[PDB]
Design a protein around this nucleic acid. Structure first.
Ligand SMILES: [Mn+2]
Ligand SMILES: [Mn+2]
Ligand SMILES: [Mn+2]
Ligand SMILES: [Mn+2]
Ligand SMILES: [Mn+2]
Ligand SMILES: [Mn+2]
Ligand SMILES: [Zn+2]
Ligand SMILES: [Zn+2]
Lengths: 184, 368, 368, 184
DNA sequence: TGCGAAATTCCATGACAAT
DNA sequence: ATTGTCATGGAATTTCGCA
DNA sequence: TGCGAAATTCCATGACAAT
DNA sequence: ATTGTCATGGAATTTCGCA
């Protein structure tokens, strides 16, 4: 069998609802399977049409051979199925209640939720503006397994924003207290 | 003046007046019989006024001024006095065209890496499509890979919104642009400083300098036009299509598409190249680094028969940018402070601000 | 299609498929191992659809279309099928630029006599001066002698008023002009027929054809600009001055002024030439006839490396005159009915009207 | 002495008043002395300023060395004298009551008045429009003395409007009757 | 039948434009 | 059913002045 | 080690423009 | 404180297929 490649497979999922930021409530998350590169798109709903709208942006840059998701309503609709067929994209579902992907992807997805949570706290409504810097962060994060960042694997160069501080990701004493406040 | 003319009348040799001619007097005027006929020799003290009257009839150049003068007068080295006057007629200097071409263009090195340098620019106004009038075009200098954004105005705010989305992917070292209000605003400067992005600007009125993106604008409008043939010009929905289409088009000289130069592998688009199917990603990126370094690069063309290149201290004139009706096309002479490169100079515009300026917008002042 | 492909699979030679290659079968598709790798050989019946899908991604030309196709397929003489498609893509044919230059310009003979041919034209709009916005320019083809008239509009009525004053002096055989409303009106046609004046028109959008007068417009604006430097642009009162000034300016290549070519003797203006003071008028006119016949005449320049000249029956395309945003710059192909001269043709525009048209506004349709 | 030349001397004079034609009442007449070429300008008055205005047109084409006239008020004013001085034109006057010029000029001037009279009659108000064709006529009229028309002497070529019919210039029976009517 | 300098000629460059 | 033109000022070439 | 045809490369042409 | 670019399709050149 042939070595894994970028664009071979995109893993997608929704995160949310979140506090409203500039009208938006969810994040559609796309992770390339080979590289672990992440794209994020803010949406107002986890619907087929918000999905199509966002993916239409992404697929203007690059088209996956396969999209993998859970059996979310957005992803199993016949509209979404026709959209993918039009673009030659094969759709692929984890079985219900049994989410599955890859170690790299799972961990990547873990990092994404933690990092969001970490920056949400203190300013839970300002995340829309932070979405760009979050992606740079994720994508310029060194992988223990592969010896490269997603940026390096996707483009074959070093980046102009290395993230030299592999940071906490865990909440400080202060934030735990005030994220406990928010969740009240 | 009339002293020199006196000596001459009694046959004593003066330098410049050929001895073999008969210099006489008549009607109070010194004359001479020349092969062309009999001409008046005015005294030195009358000559500049004469050259000026002749020149001023129609503000004529060297020969056309001389032919007037020569109808009545002769004296030694007339064209020298003619040229002296042309070099001091302010109206001629700022109104006449140049007849010296610019020196041959530079072919600047292609950026070494994707994201080293972006070239950005606006296209429009276009026919309104869903409220949108303009397209922000961002071209990666190394790869040619291009991003497109519809806007309602070519504004700083629209630019910042779009580049915030783009820079989600990566941050570039340099962004090169022209002097459009949207790129020269302090707000945009802040946006870039906040991100470690260095702003680079074209010399004014010289789109050749933004050539990478201008050229891409052409391909963008061309494909848009074709896709809209016999439909109404509803172009907003075609932007994503055109973006993808051009990013995956081969340049015949390179044998690569901008997509390939950016990623080293085709995504799931029609006719995807499959030659590196058996390589690992690492082997693929290795071959990509090699391909990047050995891309064809054009060389500076031959200078035209009559070009000029700037020298420090030279008197040169900058083209007036938007001259009003019946107004001069050139500014007053100014001096070359520094030669940045053979196509770019700093001039002291005798106000005097320092201006960085293309030689395409300069002429060397005539008659030294 | 699949018949040809069948024979090939059992090793029997087909013309076009090189024998030395191994043509096998796999996944239901005929394939071949080529130096570049393994390619699918589609049946003849699939090829045009393939070439079309590849071409349509970005409406690419020969090589850029081929490089797409070659990623998946091989077959004999692919570019022939590619070129066949380019030659039938309507959108490409009317949208692409030409890459063939026009053949070298003609240098038509100078009119033999003053009043044989006038070239007329309007300059403007200029900044308002005493209510006037335009200048009617009349240039005598033989002499270059020029008359100037201020008007409030570039109208037939203003033109007729001015030429009635001018034709008080003499009536010309021909008046050449462009296709401005003022010259193509039936009223102006009547005015000329009433006087035995033949009207000649330039091919449309080709001011080179009115080159004599366009060129004079340049000198007119240039002198006006100079005389108005640092004053307000009150040009109405300068028209008479500029007229006289230019009519009495030497052309360096000719060694004569237009005034001299018209009358054979300077009037009472500054620096009047006096070389024929001792000739009788008859002797003067005699020398004038001689001078007129021996004026320098330029020759047609060398053709550029890659020019085209029209041949009767050729498919060519006329440039769209004022194309809207995002619309094609070229009309549909049309046919050369008659070659009037190597720079001028009559085309049947497939409506079909006959149009007389400059080759500068034509491209030869690509791919035959 | 040197042979006579065009532009050597312009003879000028007023004719009128005439019936009003499009507001105009007089004709300023200029005849080049050497060639006999005629220029005509309609004016509203025989004043210095109408003279200057008209001559400014003519002297935009060609400048006489000398202008000759009678002692008409228009021509003897200090304004007219300054105008000529500015242009390097010498002014020259016939003595009062003793008009003088040249045979060619006198005859030319005779022809002009006769031809006008001839065309005035029948349509005495339409002369403004006829001024052009009148000049062509005069200027393409063969000279008995010199063997050429003014056109030929001025330009050194044949013209595109030869006036092959050296016409009557004398009034027919009908016109004498109806010019006698007009003068009533 | 020759030299240095002046005069003339050559000629690339650019700007006039256009239903 | 017609078609490029020509002022400009450095350079290249010719002529002039002298011997 | 040479030929005819196909494939590739070369490259003049033109169009993107601009406080 | 900077700098032209590159798709296009005939032509010119190289390579391919065969012997
Ligand atoms: Mn989910
Ligand atoms: Mn711009
Ligand atoms: Mn016009
Ligand atoms: Mn009188
Ligand atoms: Mn014009
Ligand atoms: Mn631009
Ligand atoms: Zn001047
Ligand atoms: Zn096409």
């Amino acid at each position: 069998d042939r070595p894994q490649k970028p664009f071979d497979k995109f893993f997608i999922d929704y995160i949310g609802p979140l506090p409203p930021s500039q009208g938006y409530l969810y994040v559609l998350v796309v992770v390339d399977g080979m590289t672990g590169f992440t794209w994020l798109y803010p949406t107002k709903a986890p619907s087929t049409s918000a999905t199509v709208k966002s993916l239409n942006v992404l697929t203007s840059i690059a088209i996956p051979k396969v999209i993998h998701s859970d059996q979310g309503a957005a992803f199993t609709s016949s509209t979404f199925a026709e959209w993918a067929k039009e673009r030659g994209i094969h759709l692929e579902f984890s079985t219900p209640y049994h989410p599955q992907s890859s170690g790299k992807v799972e961990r990547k997805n873990s990092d994404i939720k933690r990092l969001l949570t970490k920056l949400l706290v203190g300013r839970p409504t300002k995340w829309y503006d932070l979405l760009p810097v979050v992606q740079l962060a994720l994508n310029n994060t060194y992988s223990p397994v592969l010896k490269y960042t997603p940026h390096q694997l996707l483009f074959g160069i070093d980046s102009n924003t290395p993230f030299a501080n592999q940071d906490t990701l865990d909440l400080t004493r202060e934030e735990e207290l005030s994220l406990l406040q928010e969740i009240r | 003046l009339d002293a020199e003319l006196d000596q001459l009348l009694q046959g004593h040799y003066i330098k410049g007046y050929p001895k073999q001619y008969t210099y006489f007097l008549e009607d109070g005027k010194v004359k001479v019989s020349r092969p062309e006929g009999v001409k008046i020799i005015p005294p030195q003290s009358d000559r500049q006024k004469i050259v000026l009257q002749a020149h001023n009839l129609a503000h004529t150049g060297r020969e056309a001024t001389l032919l007037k003068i020569a109808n009545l007068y002769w004296w030694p080295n007339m064209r020298k006095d003619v040229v002296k006057q042309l070099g001091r007629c302010q109206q001629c200097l700022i109104t006449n065209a140049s007849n010296k071409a610019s020196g041959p263009i530079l072919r600047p090195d292609r950026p070494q890496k994707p994201f080293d340098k972006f070239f950005i620019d606006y296209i429009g106004p276009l026919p309104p499509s869903q409220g949108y009038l303009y397209v922000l075009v961002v071209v990666d200098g190394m790869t040619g890979f291009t991003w497109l954004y519809p806007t309602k105005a070519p504004s700083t705010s629209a630019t910042v919104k779009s580049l915030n989305v783009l820079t989600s992917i990566a941050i570039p070292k340099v962004i090169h642009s022209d002097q459009g209000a949207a790129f020269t605003s302090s707000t945009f400067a802040e946006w870039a400083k906040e991100r470690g992005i260095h702003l680079e600007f074209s010399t004014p009125y010289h789109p050749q300098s933004s050539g990478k993106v201008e050229r891409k604008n052409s391909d963008i409008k061309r494909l848009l036009t074709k896709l809209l043939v016999g439909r109404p010009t509803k172009w907003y929905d075609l932007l994503p299509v055109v973006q993808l289409a051009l990013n995956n088009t081969y340049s015949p000289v390179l044998k690569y598409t901008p997509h390939q130069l950016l990623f080293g592998i085709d995504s799931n688009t029609p006719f995807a190249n499959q030659d590196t199917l058996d390589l690992t990603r690492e082997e693929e990126l290795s071959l990509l680094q090699e391909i990047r370094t050995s891309l064809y690069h054009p060389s500076t063309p031959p200078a035209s028969s009559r070009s000029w290149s700037p020298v420090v201290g030279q008197l040169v004139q900058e083209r007036v940018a938007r001259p009003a009706s019946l107004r001069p096309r050139w500014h007053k002479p100014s001096t070359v402070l520094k030669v940045l490169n053979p196509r770019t100079v700093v001039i002291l515009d005798h106000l005097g601000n320092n201006r960085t300026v293309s030689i395409d917008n300069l002429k060397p002042t005539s008659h030294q």
